[PDB]
Amino acid sequence: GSLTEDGLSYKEKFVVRSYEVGSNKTATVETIANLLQEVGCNHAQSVGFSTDGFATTTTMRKLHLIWVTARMHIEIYKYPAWGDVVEIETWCQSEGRIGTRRDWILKDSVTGEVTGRATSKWVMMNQDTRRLQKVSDDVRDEYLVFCPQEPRLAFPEENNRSLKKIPKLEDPAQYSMIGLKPRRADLDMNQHVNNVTYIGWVLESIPQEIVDTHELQVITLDYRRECQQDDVVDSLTTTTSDSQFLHLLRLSGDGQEINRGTTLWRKK
Amino acid sequence: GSLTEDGLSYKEKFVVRSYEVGSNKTATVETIANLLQEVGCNHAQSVGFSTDGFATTTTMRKLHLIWVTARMHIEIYKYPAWGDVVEIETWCQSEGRIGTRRDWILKDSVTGEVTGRATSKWVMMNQDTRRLQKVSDDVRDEYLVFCPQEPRLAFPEENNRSLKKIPKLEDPAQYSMIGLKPRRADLDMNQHVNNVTYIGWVLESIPQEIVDTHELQVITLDYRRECQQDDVVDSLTTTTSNDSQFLHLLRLSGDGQEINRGTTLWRKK
Ligand SMILES: Nc1ccc2oc(=O)ccc2c1
Ligand SMILES: Nc1ccc2oc(=O)ccc2c1
Numbered sequence: 001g002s003l004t005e006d007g008l009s010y011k012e013k014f015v016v017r018s019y020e021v022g023s024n025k026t027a028t029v030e031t032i033a034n035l036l037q038e039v040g041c042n043h044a045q046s047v048g049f050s051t052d053g054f055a056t057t058t059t060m061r062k063l064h065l066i067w068v069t070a071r072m073h074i075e076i077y078k079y080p081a082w083g084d085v086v087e088i089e090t091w092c093q094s095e096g097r098i099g100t101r102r103d104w105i106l107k108d109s110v111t112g113e114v115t116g117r118a119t120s121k122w123v124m125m126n127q128d129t130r131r132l133q134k135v136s137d138d139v140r141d142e143y144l145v146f147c148p149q150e151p152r153l154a155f156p157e158e159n160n161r162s163l164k165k166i167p168k169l170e171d172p173a174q175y176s177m178i179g180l181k182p183r184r185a186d187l188d189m190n191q192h193v194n195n196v197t198y199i200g201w202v203l204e205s206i207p208q209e210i211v212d213t214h215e216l217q218v219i220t221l222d223y224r225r226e227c228q229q230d231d232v233v234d235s236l237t238t239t240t241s242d243s244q245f246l247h248l249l250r251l252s253g254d255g256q257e258i259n260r261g262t263t264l265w266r267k268k
Numbered sequence: 269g270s271l272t273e274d275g276l277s278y279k280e281k282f283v284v285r286s287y288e289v290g291s292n293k294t295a296t297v298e299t300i301a302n303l304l305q306e307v308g309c310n311h312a313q314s315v316g317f318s319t320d321g322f323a324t325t326t327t328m329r330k331l332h333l334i335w336v337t338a339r340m341h342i343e344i345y346k347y348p349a350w351g352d353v354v355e356i357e358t359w360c361q362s363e364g365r366i367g368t369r370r371d372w373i374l375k376d377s378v379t380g381e382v383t384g385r386a387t388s389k390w391v392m393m394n395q396d397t398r399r400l401q402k403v404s405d406d407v408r409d410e411y412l413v414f415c416p417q418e419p420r421l422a423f424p425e426e427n428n429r430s431l432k433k434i435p436k437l438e439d440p441a442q443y444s445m446i447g448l449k450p451r452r453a454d455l456d457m458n459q460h461v462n463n464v465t466y467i468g469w470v471l472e473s474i475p476q477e478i479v480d481t482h483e484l485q486v487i488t489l490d491y492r493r494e495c496q497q498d499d500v501v502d503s504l505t506t507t508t509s510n511d512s513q514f515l516h517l518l519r520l521s522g523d524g525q526e527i528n529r530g531t532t533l534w535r536k537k
Contacts, residue, residue: 018309018321019302019464021457030453034287041286051350053286082319082457179447184479185298185468189289189350196287200453211452 001042008148009091010043013109016080026079027086029203029216033074033196036104036118039088047146052190055092057142060124065133067100067122069195073155073162073220076116078108085109093147097134099123100143103154117154119162166222166260169248173236177204179252180233193227198259202247205237206263214243214265221261227251233258242266269310276416277359278311281377284348294347295354297471297484301342301464304372304386307356315414320458323360325410328392333401335368335390337463341423341430341488344384346376353377361415365402367391368411371422385422387430434490434529437517441504445472447521448501461495466528470516473505474532482512482534489530495520501527510536 001012020031037053044055054066080086090104099122106116124139125132155162186197199221227233232252240246242264249259269280288299305321312323322334348354358372367390374384392407393400423430454465467489495501500521508515511533518528 017302017306018319019305019456019462022452022455023457023459025457028453034285037287038285045351051286083313179449180451181447183448183468183472184290185296187290188287189291189293191291194287200451204451 001039001046003043003046004089007047008146009089010039010046011087011089012039012042013085013087014038016082016084016086018082021082023212024079024215026081029074029076029079029219030196030200032076032079032106032116033072033199034194035086035088036074036090036120037194037196039090039104040102043090043092053188057139059139059142064127065124065139066127068125069120069223070099070123071121071220071222072118072195072199073120073218074116074118075155075161075218076106076216078113078115079215080108080115086115091148091152092143093152094135094140094143095121096140099135103152105154119154161218161220161264164220164262166220166262167246168257168260169236169238169246173205173248174238175205175207176234176236177201178234180204180235181231182227182229187229191229193229195223198223198227198249201233201235201249202237202259202261202263203235205235205247206245210243210265214267216263217242217266218264219261220263221247221259223259225256225258227258269307269314271311271314272357275315276414277357278307278314279355279357280307280310281353281355282306284350284352284354286350289350291480292347292483294349297342297344297347297487298464298468300344300347300374300384301340301467302462303354303356304342304358304388305462305464307358307372308370311358311360321456325407327407327410332395333392333407334395336393337388337491338367338391339389339488339490340386340463340467341388341486342384342386343423343429343486344374344484346381346383347483348376348383354383359416359420360411361420362403362408362411363389364408367403371420373422387422429486429488429533432488432531434488434531435515436526436529437504437506437515441473441517442506443473443475444505445469445503448472448503449499450495450497455497459497461497463491466491466495466518469501469503469518470505470528470530470532471503473503473516474514478512478534482536484532485511485535486533487530488532489516489528491528493525493527495527512536 022028045051049055087107087109092102104118236248247261290296313319317323355375355377360370372386504517516530
């Protein structure tokens with residue numbers, strides 16, 4: 001991979017692996033989400049930020065501040081097959097005092113056609129107290145020279161799906177998968193649950209018949225609180241409709257919300 | 269990746285990814301085991317066998333026969349760090365009528381040093397009845413031209429760890445992790461649990477204090493029966509031992525049917 005000519009975005013190619021594909025012989029959405037994290041990490045490394053997934057500055061490090069994902073939105077038009085080469089381009093852009101955004105564009109390396117798009121919203125948090133805070137002018141000014149100055153959005157369209165508010169699923173859920181728990185493979189280098197694991201957990205409560213007859217086109221996931229290494233999660237889903245679903249992940253005991261989301265599926 | 273000059277082995281390089289590393293900033297043993305499967309699959313593709321992980325011939329496909337893993341043995345001297353390039357070489361060799369063997373050697377691409385090695389034993393099974401059978405002379409003769417004709421072993425030493433018999437853990441286990449179940453990410457393209465998931469499940473019952481103070485050097489795992497997509501597994505471990513050694517058992521949560529047994533060897537950091 002490498003920074004592009006202008007130094008304001010990063011590109012990397014990946015060859016889809018045998019164990020990365022699902023029943024359609026194409027990459028799963030969790031494989032795509034892991035590749036988006038990998039290219040984001042390589043971009044932060046190339047310009048001197050931390051490589052732990054938080055992309056912090058030296059000033060954020062003294063204040064014990066990190067960036068944490070608030071929302072992930074992914075739209076896939078075509079999943080790459082085993083052995084195919086996919087090129088992913090990524091960039092960031094600050095969003096005032098609210099937080100920051102990392103966007104991605106996925107292309108088929110042979111045709112050059114856009115096969116998918118993603119956008120993520122991040123907020124600043126103290127790593128110890130877990131308290132959110134608005135971004136200071138000093139921190140935002142430090143990142144400006146690593147981002148495009150004019151707006152550059154993976155989802156430019158008006159009233160597009162990526163910014164829609166997600167409601168809270170009401171009990172009883174139509175479908176559920178209970179007692180989900182992370183294993184060591186679900187943890188990152190800092191022993192926290194990888195953000196992609198929550199996408200897997202949301203998808204566990206979609207009935208197998210939908211997975212067998214449809215393809216996932218869009219997923220929007222809000223992150224509210226972490227699942228700790230010793231927590232247990234219930235995944236709930238209700239049809240709201242293409243087939244569309246509303247999702248909720250909550251801690252198995254007390255029912256504390258950890259994530260909410262929506263998915264849109266196209267019949268094969 | 270590519271077949272080597274003589275066409276009897278396959279090599280492929282991999283750059284270690286951010287999400288593939290553990291608490292030491294080096295690749296986990298499950299990441300290494302997934303790379304071993306990937307290079308095995310690319311080798312089978314390059315010479316015309318199936319690419320579903322079973323590496324079958326046309327004759328095997330007619331008889332509804334597949335190769336299934338009976339044992340996996342991995343020894344790691346150094347785990348590659350994030351961003352490092354590791355080169356893996358793999359080859360197969362038939363083992364008479366018993367089954368076949370796939371071996372691997374892992375090297376650091378910059379130094380050329382051997383950083384690990386692995387060997388796996390496979391048996392032939394009818395896909396539908398799940399009945400094992402000996403390998404016919406016709407099938408073994410079909411694979412001979414794709415293997416070295418003189419012995420080539422990743423573990424040549426006498427009485428080496430890779431061929432040792434593993435005993436059955438007796439209750440009560442010293443440690444356990446109960447109620448493990450696969451999710452869709454644990455399944456392969458044919459909706460079966462990926463062999464690497466069982467390595468993860470064995471390791472779940474090792475106490476966190478061992479993982480925090482030791483490095484896994486050797487793992488030997490026997491595969492007896494599959495975990496189905498709707499099954500639930502219990503992982504049991506007992507210390508048998510500077511090095512720490514453990515005996516492992518995976519069994520179905522309800523009736524206690526054995527699915528795997530294994531041993532691990534760990535060295536203090
Ligand atoms: N606001 C902001 C935050 C994190 C960033 O990390 C990068 O790797 C490049 C740009 C960037 C911008
Ligand atoms: N006996 C045996 C079985 C499977 C094999 O698959 C390969 O990809 C190359 C050689 C080989 C040999």
